[PDB]
C-alpha cells in the first residue's frame, strides 16, 4: 500500500475498461446485448430499432 496513487491509476484504467467491456453486454432494454442475436431473428426495421 506504499504505492497508493500509482496502483490506484492502474486499478482505475483496468476498472474503466472492464466497466466499458461489461457495458457491451448490458441490455439497455434491447432483447439481447450481443449484436448477432438481434440480427438472428427479426425483420430489418424491427432489428434496426433494437
Amino acid at each position: 500500500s506504499a504505492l497508493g496513487k500509482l496502483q490506484n491509476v492502474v486499478n482505475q484504467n483496468a476498472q474503466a475498461l472492464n466497466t466499458l467491456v461489461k457495458q457491451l453486454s448490458s441490455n439497455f432494454g434491447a432483447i439481447s446485448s450481443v449484436l448477432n442475436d438481434i440480427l438472428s431473428r427479426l425483420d430489418k426495421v424491427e432489428a434496426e430499432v433494437q
Binding site: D43, K44, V45, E46
Partner: protein, 45 residues
C-alpha cells in the same frame, strides 16, 4: 401497379417480407410515397 388477392394486400410495405416482395417486387427499405389498394371484382379472370 398490379392486382393481388384481397388477403394479400397486407404485403406491400418497406422492410416487410413474403414471396411477392421477394420474387415479384422489392420495395427499398427507405421508400417514399404511398401505397393505395381496393377491391376490383370487375377484373375477376
Amino acid at each position: 401497379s398490379f392486382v393481388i388477392r384481397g388477403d394479400e394486400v397486407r404485403q406491400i410495405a418497406p422492410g416487410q417480407t413474403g414471396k411477392i416482395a421477394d420474387y415479384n417486387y422489392k420495395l427499398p427499405d427507405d421508400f417514399t410515397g404511398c401505397v393505395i389498394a381496393w377491391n376490383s371484382n370487375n377484373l375477376d379472370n
